[PDB]
Amino acid sequence: PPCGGRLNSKDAGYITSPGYPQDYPSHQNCEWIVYAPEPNQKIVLNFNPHFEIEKHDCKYDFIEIRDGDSESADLLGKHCGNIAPPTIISSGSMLYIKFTSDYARQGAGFSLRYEIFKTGSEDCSKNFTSPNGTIESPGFPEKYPHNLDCTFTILAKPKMEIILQFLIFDLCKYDWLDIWDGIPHVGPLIGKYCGTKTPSELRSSTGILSLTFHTDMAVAKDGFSARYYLVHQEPLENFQCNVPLGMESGRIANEQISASSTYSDGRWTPQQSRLHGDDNGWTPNLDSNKEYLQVDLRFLTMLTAIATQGAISRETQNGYYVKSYKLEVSTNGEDWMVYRHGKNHKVFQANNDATEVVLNKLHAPLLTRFVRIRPQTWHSGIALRLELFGCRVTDAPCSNMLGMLSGLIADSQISASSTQEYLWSPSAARLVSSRSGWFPRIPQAQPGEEWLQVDLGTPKTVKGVIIQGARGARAFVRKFKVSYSLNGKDWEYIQDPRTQQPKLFEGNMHYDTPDIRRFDPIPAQYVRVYPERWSPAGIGMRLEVLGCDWTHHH
Amino acid sequence: PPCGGRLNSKDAGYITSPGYPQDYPSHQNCEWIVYAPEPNQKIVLNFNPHFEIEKHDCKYDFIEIRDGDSESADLLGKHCGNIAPPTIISSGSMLYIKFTSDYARQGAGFSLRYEIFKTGSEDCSKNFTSPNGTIESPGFPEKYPHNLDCTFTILAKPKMEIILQFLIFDLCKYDWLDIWDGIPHVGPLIGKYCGTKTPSELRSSTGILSLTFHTDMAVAKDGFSARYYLVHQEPLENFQCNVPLGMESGRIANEQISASSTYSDGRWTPQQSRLHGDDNGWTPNLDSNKEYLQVDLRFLTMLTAIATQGAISRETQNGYYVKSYKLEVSTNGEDWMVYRHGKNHKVFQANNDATEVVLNKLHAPLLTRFVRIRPQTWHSGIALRLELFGCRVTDAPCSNMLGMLSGLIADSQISASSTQEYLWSPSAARLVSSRSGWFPRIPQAQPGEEWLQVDLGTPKTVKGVIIQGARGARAFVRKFKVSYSLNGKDWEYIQDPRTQQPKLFEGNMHYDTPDIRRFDPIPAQYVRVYPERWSPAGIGMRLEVLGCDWTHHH
């Protein structure tokens, strides 16, 4: 019975060092997460006075309570010895406990009790179904005289884009509103907002977009008002994936554009990098190949071309421009890939002057969120104007992301052949959003032996998979096969007609930058990816499934 | 107002981070000791809920409560964040608190309240004045149905040796009895005893010898019975400091003799190293120059000669013997000095055979407690029989140690020109017993500017000083002068007749091994040592004063 887990504190419970009161084993790594079922609520822990753990200076054995979830939450306490810790009340809806044991000597251990601590706050959450409506604070334009902690999620039928736009925003410890590309703390974070930091319009085709929203009576007046729209799309076949993603049009907001630095005078800001801008452009604080213009596309986007120009100094008529550059991309803005062509990097031939435009279509389309252009050579200085071109992965017909990334596929529908940790969070396998990835028990396994499986929950038309490496000697899958099933019990491998043989799909060349693999549309409730080849570090994988719903007679 | 100190919890009090509730300063090192006036008692602390200290993982700012006194007591708790620690009850009569602040950002801090926690235990302490009597547990031979925590101290008029000898000893966490060469936790520890570890006879001429004695109801039957005697001595002038210290006679107990190792068969134990023993001798487990025979003389003794022999294997008639050796000495068994002759070490020419005895008189007498002989060359193997010769520093006439080592001179009677720590424990200046030593504020001072001073408390005949280096780049004083005074206000330097000039005494050649300096007996209530020269690390010093009481007409 593997120690640790995730407990839903709706019902008060206990957590104790494995043996307790029997002495705890050596070489031990229990971690728990205690969560309340409402954002509203807090967790409270009270320890049993009979508490014994090894002394010294907690160098060796100890208990650690952290505030939130994961090891990078703030440390509420680290204890060891014979004194139980004092009541720990969470500040969020979640707590993380970790027990550590050295390979030498032990003691009785510890027992605590968890339960929901009620603060006074109200859960004002609402789901939004309707074609158009207002999402706002209760009582807006004024203060709702109560704490709040609320989920607003927009849900859209497939083929419908969600447009969210904020009218007023008036709020980072007391108040905040984060926006999620999915279910909160399951989908990726689009961004945390607070203050009068009024957030730019968002267009999501993920099928959900949700806001978590928290307030305090200590903030005198605060609230927000937004509008949402559900606009029908129509996937053409005759459709090129080369539309501009919106530097010139502005569909990419200033908020989304950033850079390593900018000139001291502040007259060559990032927000001037928009293609065809009549006011200078982007230049950094120095000119070196260690510099970059960053655009956050917010949602997982397909990039197919880059177009760049130089810039004429509006105050001096000088002509600055980039002559060549590298491209650097990431799904989360933390893990980065420099675009390759063959073995080594790809140097893009850019401009010959300030005014004229130079286009560069990528070799093949690249799936990402954050984009960095990186100047390598230039004339005079580093000037830059830019458009990005591509389209949505959803613009293909029957090509919806089916829930791994958002959270509409639950943890319960995500299974695997083996897993390396005794007790393994199924959300670890989610494309982009998972903090690490799926690793099997011996991650250097024999091919066709290991697999990850997704239960879509009802029979769907499945048309592709998106495959990604693993974040946390960095594993990714180099080649794989796919089987599908309706019964969960009778399975067909996706066949290759040339070879007459289970088709062997290409995988990733990188632990972060994912790859879309499509195939003839088949009916399936269950899909399985079986790795065949991988990087030297072993199998590490994240996955999403592409497809759409089933639909005549007389 | 320097933060930290020593508080006597007889009256309940408060301790808070300097500013509290004003934010605490950066770069901060407050340490406190909270002590109960009876061994009997425990300390309890309760914290104020309004507790704020910097987070992260207590890497930077924190509070530490340790169980006893000093940094090497067990850690009862280390806290940081916004959660005050839970009640901490001591296990002894003392607690140690330390607050740490980084050079970056702070918070409100902390406040706690201290007071005596009553456990139930009885303080059965007695002082012993009388010529002869029994020191024992209450109710001995049986269990006193109560916890106990008691000081037994023997006090002797000067010129009287104290002899303590134990009849029965029947007791290391629940029960113990430590014996102190002085006032407990002020004088040196002679040794901690517990179990049926029946302690050997002790002869102390220090003027006090005391026992601390602790029991528990969890130990079913325990107690001890001892006898003490006060025997009059008479200091001769015609007296050589060359008496045997008691390997052959046995006045040095087996308990006191030890070694790096011993042969595997257990037939050459340390307890066979007694001079003229008819059963083999001492041999180690290997034969190498990294080996030693150790004798603990218990009290600060004067060593003047070493006599050694070899040994004939009683079971095989072979002849083993040491040919040369080095001598290694320490006042506390932790800090060691290898005896020198001129620059380099002193190799002693020992034996030429097993049977015959070889004497070696030291160059000049050496003041120590722990002695190690260290074989360098030998015939066949390392065999050793041994006598140590010398006498008591007290065997000189009017040469009593006047209280620095024992604690009969109080902290209040110990003053200095400067001191390096803002708030400076006066007991730091005590010969042998002090854990570190007296250091001035800039320990590289201008000569005659700094001084340490001892208020003997009434006008005495002072006849010498004992001077020692400092334990905690190791300071000792190489040359010094001494002034004395009756008024505390009119001061005479001890003059040198040859030079007609304040006499300049030789100091130490070592941070541990002390040196006795005597002089014409003068009347004095106050004595001052003024360092003139020192080691490269600066002034560091410990001191005792030698002398005796004032006494005719018609």
Epitope: P21, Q22, N46, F47, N48, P49, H50, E52, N82, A84, P86, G107, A108, S111 | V44, P86, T87, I89, S91, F117, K118, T119, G120, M217, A218
Partner: antibody, heavy 124, light 108 residues
Framework: EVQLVESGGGLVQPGGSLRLSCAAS????????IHWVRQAPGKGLEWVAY????????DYADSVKGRFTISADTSKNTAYLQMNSLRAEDTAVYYC?????????????????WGQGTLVTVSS | DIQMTQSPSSLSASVGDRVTITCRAS??????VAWYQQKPGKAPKLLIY???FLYSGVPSRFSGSGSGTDFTLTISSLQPEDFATYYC?????????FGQGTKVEIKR
Amino acid sequence: EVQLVESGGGLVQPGGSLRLSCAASGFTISGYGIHWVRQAPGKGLEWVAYIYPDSGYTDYADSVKGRFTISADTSKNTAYLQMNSLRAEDTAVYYCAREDFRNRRRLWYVMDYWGQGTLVTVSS
Amino acid sequence: DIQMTQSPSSLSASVGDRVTITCRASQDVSTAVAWYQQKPGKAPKLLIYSASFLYSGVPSRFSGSGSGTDFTLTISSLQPEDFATYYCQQAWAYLPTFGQGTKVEIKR
């Protein structure tokens, strides 16, 4: 000298209420465990409840849970046991006993000192 | 709750006889078992803690063994004053419990 002296026991109407007092002399009760153990006339010892006043940890035998409320006033160095909705079968002598657990894993839930007992009788 | 049951529930035996009370716990209890002695109309007295450790003042003629689910008190040289009722208690679970008790009678 460590002592416990109960008081406040006696005859009481069924359904009625009553409040025992365990009064510590010789030591501070906070930072010990104070247990109540009852003994029905000529029958064995039943553990009923306990308190650890520093923390507040309390707990109760099912036979009394919901009806009894152990508590402690450390300014008065006393522990209480407030019994409500009293049934006949609560009739017994009620001992309070000390548990010394801090630093003593082998003596956890061991009751080293016992009060003299007070008699609670439940009759119409 | 962990239940403790004692064996026998009463015994008579002569002065100087060795005497053996037994206590079986309804599930493993490591050595966490205490023995008390109750004389009639008096509060119980701790005799043994942690299965085998004599508490202060207790005549060494008392001793405890046991190690898991069966435990045993032993009065080696019975005395008149040892007339009493003897309780075992488990000191392991969150909630303590006692045995129903063994009543010792002296045979004269």
